[PDB]
Amino acid sequence: EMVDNLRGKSGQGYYVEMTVGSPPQTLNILVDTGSSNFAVGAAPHPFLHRYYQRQLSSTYRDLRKGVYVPYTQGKWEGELGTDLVSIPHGPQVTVRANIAAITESDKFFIQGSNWEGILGLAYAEIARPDDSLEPFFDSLVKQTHVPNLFSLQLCGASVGGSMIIGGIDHSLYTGSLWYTPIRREWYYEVIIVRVEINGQDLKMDCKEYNYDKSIVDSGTTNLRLPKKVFEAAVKSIKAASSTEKFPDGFWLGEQLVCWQAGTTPWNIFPVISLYLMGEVTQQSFRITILPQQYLRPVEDVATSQDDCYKFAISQSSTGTVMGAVIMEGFYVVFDRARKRIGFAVSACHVHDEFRTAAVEGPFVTLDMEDCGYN
Numbered sequence: 507e508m509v510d511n512l513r514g515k516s517g518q519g520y521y522v523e524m525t526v527g528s529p530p531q532t533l534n535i536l537v538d539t540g541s542s543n544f545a546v547g548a549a550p551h552p553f554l555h556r557y558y559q560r561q562l563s564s565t566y567r568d569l570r571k572g573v574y575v576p577y578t579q580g581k582w583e584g585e586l587g588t589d590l591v592s593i594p595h596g597p598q599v600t601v602r603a604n605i606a607a608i609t610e611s612d613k614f615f616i617q618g619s620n621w622e623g624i625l626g627l628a629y630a631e632i633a634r635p636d637d638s639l640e641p642f643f644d645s646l647v648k649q650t651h652v653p654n655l656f657s658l659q660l661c662g663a664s665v666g667g668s669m670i671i672g673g674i675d676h677s678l679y680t681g682s683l684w685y686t687p688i689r690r691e692w693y694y695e696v697i698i699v700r701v702e703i704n705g706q707d708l709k710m711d712c713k714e715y716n717y718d719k720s721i722v723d724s725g726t727t728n729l730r731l732p733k734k735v736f737e738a739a740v741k742s743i744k745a746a747s748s749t750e751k752f753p754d755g756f757w758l759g760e761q762l763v764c765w766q767a768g769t770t771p772w773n774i775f776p777v778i779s780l781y782l783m784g785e786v787t788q789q790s791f792r793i794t795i796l797p798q799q800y801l802r803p804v805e806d807v808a809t810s811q812d813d814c815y816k817f818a819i820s821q822s823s824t825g826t827v828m829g830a831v832i833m834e835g836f837y838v839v840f841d842r843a844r845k846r847i848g849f850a851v852s853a854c855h856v857h858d859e860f861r862t863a864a865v866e867g868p869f870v871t872l873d874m875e876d877c878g879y880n
């Protein structure tokens with residue numbers, strides 16, 4: 507019943523079906539671990555197939571307060587209110603929640619995305635206009651008997667996956683679940699203790715990996731890195747892939763790379779290993795990312811004699827973001843109750859006949875430095 511309740515298009519986010527209001531209005535809502543506002547289109551927009559019509563809901567209540575939310579990509583404004591909300595292919599509950607009714611936006615909605623709103627699944631501390639605006643998942647836990655946990659299985663033109671609310675579906679992963687502590691309940695903030703490119707350590711003070719935070723964000727496409735880590739990573743991947751030479755704009759996300767259909771040279775690209783802080787002192791585990799994840803395919807029938815890709819690793823001035831291209835092929839458990847994040851290899855794991863994505867541990871370390879930036 508909850509398995510395969512997510513759809514999407516590549517680079518455009520993953521969405522679940524929801525209803526808002528009485529009687530219920532059906533909307534597709536992008537799943538975002540990287541924010542904390544539930545918001546839906548509530549006025550006509552060229553890219554919106556449908557929108558929330560507050561005048562048709564008897565349960566709607568205006569809070570008489572505006573809100574503005576700018577993200578890394580896009581922004582919107584609107585009006586706070588509350589209403590009844592359900593998730594048809596989720597738990598069978600109806601909850602009264604805070605809803606921002608988007609009445610104006612800029613570069614937020616995406617042409618042909620199939621979604622009309624966003625579900626911020628992070629904590630109150632980053633909610634706008636402030637932490638008194640109770641996020642949806644908190645409302646759900648408080649009002650129903652749903653356990654304080656959800657899991658995401660994102661799979662890689664159209665895509666799919668599963669959001670499991672209130673527990674863990676063993677059928678969605680193989681091997682062991684490894685847990686990294688949530689350092690601070692605002693974003694799902696975690697700590698990276700080491701980065702290797704094709705087995706070779708980037709040899710940087712580990713605080714750099716976390717300048718000025720590291721988050722797990724289903725609402726952001728790319729792996730985003732602080733400039734210093736980004737520069738060092740690109741150098742290493744360039745070196746590893748030097749059998750071919752790409753335009754500088756490729757590495758900067760300004761240009762596709764294309765190969766004749768079926769001939770993508772996966773093997774010239776390295777594996778990236780991210781080591782996450784363990785639940786025990788100086789211990790860690792690693793998740794390993796194949797180029798099939800960080801070279802994001804760009805579907806376009808005009809270019810379809812070729813397979814074409816964008817480099818899905820980019821530079822950040824606000825810390826590390828482990829985005830959807832990193833999450834895909836892992837089963838990720840947001841165990842809010844025990845303040846930790848679990849990673850396991852998922853049922854839709856990425857792999858060819860030579861290499862596979864993995865979650866492996868434990869790794870131990872002599873160095874007693876705390877890797878947290880602040």
Ligand SMILES: CCNc1cc(C(=O)N[C@@H](Cc2ccccc2)[C@H](O)CNCc2cccc(OC)c2)cc2c1CCCS(=O)(=O)N2C
Nearest residue numbers: 517518519540541576577578579580614725726727728820
């Ligand atoms: C298909 C979405 N594409 C992207 C979304 C977002 C994003 O801001 N995501 C928002 C949510 C969002 C989802 C869909 C459209 C627009 C936005 C995340 O919430 C960002 N998370 C961290 C954050 C950053 C700043 C403010 C903030 O307020 C809560 C939260 C960012 C980015 C992309 C794709 C372009 C390359 S990227 O992955 O490096 N990048 C800049």
